[PDB]
């Protein structure tokens, strides 16, 4: 006669991830490589967003 | 070139009012502080008033409190001193000075008046 035993499936080989590009960086060099610094008392308070 | 023009000088009846004008060329007043210094013949220089780069606060000397006013205009790059209720001891030569900038961050009670 005819009978059914089970199923068969192909497995994926690798994985890939994508994202909308990386051009939009936070300005960080101007803080680390700054022309001048702040004093021991008082300090500049910068906001990054 | 950094050049400052002091105009409006004159001799007026005591107790009257007059407005002194200063012209700044080569830079912008909005980023710097100004000093007004008077010097009488036969005497030493006498500090009068200052204006900060941001215009948040104003300081005068005790001899000029409540009688003169200082003002600035960023649009035309012009500096105005309002002299009111003049007294005979005010005979001096007034100089308009330029102080350091917020461009160069320095501690409080700022240091200024390097060229005028």
From Swiss-Prot, chain A:
Changing residue 36 to T: In strain: Omicron/BQ.1.1, Omicron/XBB.1.5, Omicron/EG.5.1. Residues 9-25 are annotated as: Disordered. It comes from the Viruses. Glycans are attached at residues 13, 15, 21, 33. Binds to host ACE2. RBD also interacts with the N-linked glycan on 'Asn-90' of ACE2. Cleavage of S generates a polybasic C-terminal sequence on S1 that binds to host Neuropilin-1 (NRP1) and Neuropilin-2 (NRP2) receptors. Interacts with host integrin alpha-5/beta-1 (ITGA5:ITGB1) and with ACE2 in complex with integrin alpha-5/beta-1 (ITGA5:ITGB1). May interact via cytoplasmic c-terminus with M protein. May interact (via N-terminus) with host bilirubin and biliverdin, thereby preventing antibody binding to the SARS-CoV-2 spike NTD via an allosteric mechanism. Attaches the virion to the cell membrane by interacting with host receptor, initiating the infection. The major receptor is host ACE2. When S2/S2' has been cleaved, binding to the receptor triggers direct fusion at the cell membrane. When S2/S2' has not been cleaved, binding to the receptor results in internalization of the virus by endocytosis using host TFRC and GRM2 and leading to fusion of the virion membrane with the host endosomal membrane. Alternatively, may use NRP1/NRP2 and integrin as entry receptors. This is Spike protein S1. The lineage of its organism: Viruses, Riboviria, Orthornavirae, Pisuviricota, Pisoniviricetes. The chain holds residues 311 to 359 of 1273 of the full protein.
